[PDB]
Design a protein around this ligand. Sequence first.
Ligand SMILES: [Cl-]
Ligand SMILES: [Cl-]
Ligand SMILES: [Cl-]
Ligand SMILES: [Cl-]
Ligand SMILES: [Cl-]
Ligand SMILES: [Cl-]
Ligand SMILES: [Cl-]
Ligand SMILES: [Cl-]
Ligand SMILES: [Zn+2]
Ligand SMILES: [Zn+2]
Ligand SMILES: [Zn+2]
Ligand SMILES: [Zn+2]
Ligand SMILES: [Zn+2]
Ligand SMILES: [Zn+2]
Ligand SMILES: [Zn+2]
Ligand SMILES: [Zn+2]
Ligand SMILES: [Zn+2]
Ligand SMILES: [Zn+2]
Ligand SMILES: [Zn+2]
Ligand SMILES: [Zn+2]
Ligand SMILES: [Zn+2]
Length: 371
Amino acid sequence: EPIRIGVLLTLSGPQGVNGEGNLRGLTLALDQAGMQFGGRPVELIIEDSAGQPEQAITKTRQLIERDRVHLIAGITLSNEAAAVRDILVQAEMPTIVTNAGLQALTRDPAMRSPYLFRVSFANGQYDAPAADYAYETLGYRRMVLHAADYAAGHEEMAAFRSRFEQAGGEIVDEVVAPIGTQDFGPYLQRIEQAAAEADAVFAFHGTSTDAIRFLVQYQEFGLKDSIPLIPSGADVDQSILPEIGDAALGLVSGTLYTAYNDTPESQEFVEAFTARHEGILPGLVDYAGYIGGRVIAEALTAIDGEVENKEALLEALKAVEFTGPAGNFRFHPESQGPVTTILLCRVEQLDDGTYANIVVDRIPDFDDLSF
Ligand SMILES: [Cl-]
Ligand SMILES: [Cl-]
Ligand SMILES: [Cl-]
Ligand SMILES: [Cl-]
Ligand SMILES: [Cl-]
Ligand SMILES: [Cl-]
Ligand SMILES: [Cl-]
Ligand SMILES: [Cl-]
Ligand SMILES: [Zn+2]
Ligand SMILES: [Zn+2]
Ligand SMILES: [Zn+2]
Ligand SMILES: [Zn+2]
Ligand SMILES: [Zn+2]
Ligand SMILES: [Zn+2]
Ligand SMILES: [Zn+2]
Ligand SMILES: [Zn+2]
Ligand SMILES: [Zn+2]
Ligand SMILES: [Zn+2]
Ligand SMILES: [Zn+2]
Ligand SMILES: [Zn+2]
Ligand SMILES: [Zn+2]
């Protein structure tokens, strides 16, 4: 009778804030759907991976072997994804990835699988349209790239470069800074110098204290006044927008979602989210969890809960389509990553003092293969 769904997330340690966001979005979607399908109650079995590959393995083995779940959602870190991929595939377990943006998982034909779906992004996917915007609308021809020095950072630089290069632009330098950098001074100076022969900078750190320290120092050091900057959408996420504030004002970025999107489905998700979370606005990770849950809900509805029929479950997941809070969402038929609407936004200040990502332009049907 019950429909058992495993959720593997990083819910403690410094990455726990991301898993928590995913879990809020996911449960909100399953609750709007009533937590039952075809007369069958859902039960979520939640396991914390603590951001650790070996614990991700243990947890994943347990949900499959002990808990006998019919589906797994989540996976916070790319290193956790890489460590459990083979287990999920060998077990023929339908899996909905809500965060881990590891490019290979959908883009490399050897890592992909019909059991793996991704509803968040491949790294770089929501930033790459900002490179089109930089070339086509802003007139930039030569850019400097900067990122925190880890895998997602490299992949975001590469995705940005690829689109900027395809439009006819050129990348003059890449500047990388270690994770947990306190003084961005030296990296800022290097960026300044590269930008003598450049029109603008793109920077990614993820939604992190790195991002806060970088943006704030970018302005304080004087570069905001002189060198246009396109932050990653992660770097101006809602959760940290109040602490940047003034440093990101007027900056344009690509993003997956903002609570200020002026569509009815976005307004409905903000209302249901804020009613549940004491006025707090949903951000990126909440959004991505929500799409996870809606996908599951739409697939389960279509097969009337007959979740043990894996063939029908997979065919139903492949066919899922709806208007979500960012726009229309579906899966690429070959990568099973997202084909979705990317929002180009600018940070603005509202009349009450609040900082907001405001939508200036939309790129529909942007897939994870086009960069
Ligand atoms: Cl082009
Ligand atoms: Cl062109
Ligand atoms: Cl919250
Ligand atoms: Cl909460
Ligand atoms: Cl569509
Ligand atoms: Cl569309
Ligand atoms: Cl395509
Ligand atoms: Cl394509
Ligand atoms: Zn139970
Ligand atoms: Zn447990
Ligand atoms: Zn392998
Ligand atoms: Zn590196
Ligand atoms: Zn063009
Ligand atoms: Zn210094
Ligand atoms: Zn200088
Ligand atoms: Zn609706
Ligand atoms: Zn809350
Ligand atoms: Zn094809
Ligand atoms: Zn347009
Ligand atoms: Zn479309
Ligand atoms: Zn395409």
